[PDB]
Design a protein around this ligand. Structure first.
Ligand code: ZN
Ligand code: ZN
Lengths: 116, 196, 102, 72, 148, 100, 56, 231, 56
């Protein structure tokens, strides 16, 4: 995660192990620029995800006519005008929880009960 | 406007899910293989992958997508040069035009004329075609990441109906070439023999 | 043989509509503070747009393994877009969709 | 009043207008009409010319143009 | 419950600042001078060739009768220069590239010795890119390496 | 099921688990690779509390991965097997510790 | 159908014709019913071609 | 169907040229970092630029098409969530007309832009058979009825019939309908029965039939026997 | 007759309730996809079950 690019080379910095100072540096297999490892974690794989559950929530989601309105009150705004929609993770196993969006604070909440 | 061309780009993603070597290649016309994308960008002149990636992932936060792109970035690593890139492609299709200096050139011309013959066929637009080939790629990734559903082929929005206008056009157009060709031939052969 | 003459002029790029483009193939920069305006020679008082203030790595150059007579004139100081006054403009810009062939 | 919202019956006046104007075979006619007006001409003028040059000791060259088009 | 075609009865029986003049600039200059544009695409905050090197060099680097294709001049011209514009030392480097996206709607008002401007539309616009900053290549071996 | 063991859900559950194919990638959440150089001390806080916990040669790249409970507790499993499974998988070149 | 808002799983949204042939179908029901009815025609066409080949 | 028509296609150039001078920055100057929130803009599937305030852009083109300067064949779709704005002037698209609902009112709620006034102006013209010539076209140019293709249809919310659905808030023999719970209608259907083609427009009460039965008759009626032409 | 049509109307209306409930339970993520089908499928079968029991 969090790729790093070079400068004056701009390619992406692979990690090159420093054993002597004994830490991780990021090389640049084209121009020899280097720097540290801002964190020893290198790679993630992320089988079961929980992102895209709010894909493209723009400040205009309130301006889309086709989205179903709903009346519940935002925990923050305590306003009762909010559009909502299922989780945008277009995949089969996906749950059927609801993401609301208050038209006032643009705060996102959920209809959940298992985990908020 | 002219011949209603039928060039058909494709961006094939390789290796099933779960496999590695999930690399991405595209199939330009008249190129007997399919070229890794990071090349094609460089051929258009986007060298620093950090850019190439920015033609594809218009949201730098999204690191999933980048991860899917890295095995492509590393596949192009051997090449960092536009003309090599251009040269690389030129090697790979209808090698009759042996002129080496003109080899890369002809590759440089296949991009310009034969590659997305819509958005344009003039000279000097590869910045445009570059973004498009990015877009085409990005949409590919949304699907392999399940961020979008697969495409729907029966959606009537994507159909078209050729009525008598078009159908005559397609027909008449070819019948008009044939008329020229013959005129030209006669025009030639009469001049060939200076006939009246 | 190329010559970096001075390359320090604060050239200001302007994007304009076609009716403007045709008219350009005098001025009166009546800037005001940052609501920058300008008077055009007659025509209208079309203001400048701070379309892009900062413009780096962008320079003007002219010319006259073949070489040629290069001259680097000026640098982009800021990019502008035309502000069309709008009465006739929209009256014709909307009417830009009022032409065809026979 | 002439701004009361219309009622479901009123549609059929709108529909009459549509057909009183568009007929039922409009698309058959409209497309063909378009083809005859424009697409014909533009087919001609996309390749309006074809050339031929012969080289001498000065090179003779010939080329033939295609202009307006007329349909009786 | 019926269809009433007699409704045509009722409907029949119901109805400071710096102002600057700009003039017909000489053309013969323009008849030989062409004023293009240029952009460096290295992000290098300023990247003026003032600091590039010296000297700077901007330049580019039998049968019977037959019928040929037909094409307008400009494209015939534009095509017939496939030598790009370059800058070098004798070793930092840049390479040019036609842009063509916005070659038209750009007239220029360069701050001359005075604040005024002669009137100048841009001829063309070029995208200038660096090169050989790390100067590595296996132009021949690339195929060999990419096929191991 | 076995003739005596007809309608004993429990006994059935054991068989269902006995044959149902289970790969790792069905129980695990995500895999991370670090560069935590010391074999003994780990930059991650918890791994220390278990490094000694079983320390009481090896590469500096920690590969660590995380499983769901409810997944791992659906066709329920004990990491004691899971580990030794890995242990039995490659070799004992791949040192492995797992959480309790 | 473009007459519904998004993410609408109510019975009448996903195709539950509620009236009876006596009462008549509302325009959506009509269209959902016609969509189900077409699928019946295609099967019949298929089921007789594939039957015919089997039996021979 | 009866109402459906089919585009003949126009020239996209005016739109593009218009788009340029209304904020669409060309592609060559696009840098996704600085414009994280711009909207791509397509014209016949050609990416042409991005725009930073597309909401104002959309409603400009619409009225520009409801005025009648963008030829009403032209389809323009704003796909808010995908940050895209697509426009087709392509030929061959299939489209049908619809009433425009303007959620504007002194009545304080939404309602069709077409009122008894225009209806009268229409029936006046049919029974012409003194000229004010209210035709179909006038309904177009006055922004009362729009053509809608099948792609654009994705982004509207159609009402089924005006009355039963616009005003906010029973015979048991009457069929059972559902409500106007949707409060954001942007169009209304002219008549729901216009979804039928020619052959099926002759079945009486086709909504009391089993569906295949309507397919049969719609194919038999073509081999009925009548008068085929008066001559 | 009238009395009957009322009960049919009620009997239909209960189904909508039973469907509504399952919708809410599903949207509160309170459901239990019986092993061998994701939450989606479990949700569907239930619905179609009620909607078919209702007609019958
Ligand atoms: Zn570097
Ligand atoms: Zn809120």
């Amino acid at each position: 995660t969090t790729f790093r690019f070079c400068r004056d080379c701009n390619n992406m910095l692979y990690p090159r192990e420093d054993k002597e100072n004994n830490r991780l540096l990021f090389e640049c297999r084209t121009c020899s620029y280097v720097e540290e490892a801002g964190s020893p974690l290198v790679y993630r794989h992320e089988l079961i995800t929980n992102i895209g559950e709010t894909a493209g929530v723009v400040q205009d989601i309130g301006s889309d006519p086709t989205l179903p309105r709903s009346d519940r009150e935002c925990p923050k705004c305590h306003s009762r005008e909010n559009v909502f929609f299922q989780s945008q993770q277009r995949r089969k196993d996906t749950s059927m929880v609801l993401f609301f969006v208050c038209l006032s604070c643009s705060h996102i909440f959920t209809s959940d009960q298992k985990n908020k | 406007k002219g011949s209603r061309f039928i060039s058909t780009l494709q961006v094939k993603l390789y290796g099933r899910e779960g496999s590695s070597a999930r690399t991405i290649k595209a199939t330009l016309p008249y190129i007997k293989q399919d070229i890794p994308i990071v090349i094609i960008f460089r051929a258009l002149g986007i060298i620093p992958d950090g850019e190439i990636l920015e033609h594809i992932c218009y949201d730098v936060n999204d690191w999933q997508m980048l991860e899917m792109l890295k095995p492509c970035v590393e596949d192009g690593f051997v090449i960092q040069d536009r003309e090599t890139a251009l040269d690389f492609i030129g090697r790979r299709g209808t090698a009759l035009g042996i002129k080496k200096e003109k080899r890369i050139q002809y590759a440089k011309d296949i991009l310009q004329k034969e590659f997305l013959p819509h958005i344009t066929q003039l000279e000097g637009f590869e910045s445009r075609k570059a973004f498009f080939l990015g877009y085409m790629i990005n949409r590919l990734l949304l699907c392999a990441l399940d961020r979008k559903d697969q495409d729907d082929r029966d959606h009537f929005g994507k159909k078209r109906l050729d009525l008598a206008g078009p159908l005559l056009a397609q027909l008449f157009k070819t019948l008009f070439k044939k008329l020229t060709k013959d005129i030209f031939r006669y025009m030639q052969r009469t001049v060939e023999e200076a006939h009246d | 043989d190329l010559d970096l003459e001075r390359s320090n002029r604060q050239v200001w790029l302007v994007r304009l509509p076609m009716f403007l483009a045709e008219k350009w193939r005098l001025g009166k920069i009546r800037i005001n503070k940052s609501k920058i305006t300008l008077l055009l020679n007659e025509p209208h008082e079309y203001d400048l747009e701070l379309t892009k203030k900062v413009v780096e790595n962008e320079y003007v150059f002219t010319e006259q393994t073949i070489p040629k007579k290069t001259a680097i004139v000026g640098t982009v100081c800021h990019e502008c877009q035309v502000m069309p006054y709008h009465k006739i403009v929209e009256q014709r810009r909307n009417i830009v969709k009022l032409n065809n062939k026979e | 009043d002439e701004s009361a919202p219309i009622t479901a019956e009123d549609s059929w006046a709108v529909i009459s207008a549509f057909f009183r104007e568009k007929g039922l075979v409009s698309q058959q006619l409209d497309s063909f009409n378009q083809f005859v007006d424009y697409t014909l001409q533009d087919i001609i003028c996309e390749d309006s010319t074809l050339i031929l040059e012969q080289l001498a000791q000065i090179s003779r060259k010939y080329e033939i143009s295609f202009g307006k088009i007329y349909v009786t | 419950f019926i269809k009433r075609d007699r409704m045509r009865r009722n409907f029949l029986r119901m109805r400071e600042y710096n102002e600057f003049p700009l003039r017909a600039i000489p053309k013969e200059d323009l008849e030989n001078m062409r004023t293009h544009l240029l952009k460096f695409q290295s992000k290098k905050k300023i990247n003026p060739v003032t600091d590039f090197h010296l000297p700077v060099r901007l330049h580019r680097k039998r049968k019977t009768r037959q019928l040929k294709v037909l094409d307008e001049n400009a494209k015939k011209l534009r095509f017939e220069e496939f030598y790009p514009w370059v800058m070098e030392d004798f070793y930092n480097t840049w390479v040019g590239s036609y842009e063509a996206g916005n070659s038209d709607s750009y007239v220029l008002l360069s701050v001359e010795d005075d604040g005024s401007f002669t009137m100048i539309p841009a001829d063309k616009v070029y995208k200038f890119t660096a090169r050989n900053k790390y100067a590595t290549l296996t132009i021949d071996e690339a195929e060999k390496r990419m096929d191991k | 099921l076995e003739p005596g063991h007809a309608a004993d859900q429990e006994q059935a559950k054991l068989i269902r688990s006995a044959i149902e194919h289970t790969t790792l990638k069905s129980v695990t959440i995500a895999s991370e690779i670090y560069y935590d150089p010391d074999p003994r001390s780990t930059v991650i806080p918890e791994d220390e509390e278990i490094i000694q916990l079983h320390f009481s040669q090896q590469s500096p790249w920690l590969l660590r991965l995380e499983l769901d409970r409810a997944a791992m507790n659906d066709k329920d499993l004990t990491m004691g097997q899971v580990g030794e499974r890995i242990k039995q998988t490659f070799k004992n070149d791949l040192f492995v510790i797992w959480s309790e | 159908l473009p007459h519904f808002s998004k993410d609408d799983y109510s019975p009448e949204s996903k195709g539950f014709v509620e009236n009876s042939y006596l009462r008549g179908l509302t325009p959506q029901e009509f269209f959902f019913h016609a969509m189900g009815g077409r699928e019946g025609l295609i099967d019949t066409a298929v089921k007789t071609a594939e039957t015919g080949y089997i039996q021979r | 169907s009866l109402m459906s028509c089919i585009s003949v296609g126009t020239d996209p150039m005016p739109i593009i040229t218009f788009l340029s001078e209304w904020g669409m920055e060309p592609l060559e100057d696009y840098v996704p970092h600085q414009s994280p929130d711009a909207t791509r803009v397509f014209v016949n599937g050609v990416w042409h630029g991005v725009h930073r305030n597309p909401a104002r852009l959309m409603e400009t083109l619409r009225t520009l098409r409801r005025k009648g300067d963008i030829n009403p064949e032209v389809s323009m779709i704003r796909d808010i969530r995908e940050k895209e704005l697509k426009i087709f002037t392509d030929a061959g698209r299939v489209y049908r007309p619809l009433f425009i609902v303007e959620d504007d009112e002194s009545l304080g709620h939404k309602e069709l832009k077409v009122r008894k006034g225009h209806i009268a102006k229409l029936m006046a013209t049919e029974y012409q058979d003194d000229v004010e010539e209210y035709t179909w076209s006038s309904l177009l140019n006055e922004g009362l009825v729009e053509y809608i293709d099948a792609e654009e249809e994705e982004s509207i919310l159609i009402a089924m019939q005006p009355e039963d659905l616009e005003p906010a808030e029973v015979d048991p023999a009457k069929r059972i309908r559902v409500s106007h719970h949707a409060t954001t209608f942007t169009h209304c259907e002219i008549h729901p029965s216009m979804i039928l083609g020619v052959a099926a427009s002759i079945i009486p009460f086709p909504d009391h039939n089993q569906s295949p039965r309507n397919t049969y008759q719609s194919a038999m009626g073509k081999q009925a026997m009548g008068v085929f032409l008066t001559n | 007759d009238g009395p009957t049509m009322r009960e049919i109307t009620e009997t239909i209306a209960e189904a909508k309730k039973k469907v509504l409930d399952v919708t809410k339970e599903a949207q509160a993520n309170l459901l239990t996809a019986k092993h061998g089908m994701t939450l989606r499928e479990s949700f569907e079968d239930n619905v179609v079950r009620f909607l078919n029991e209702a007609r019958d």
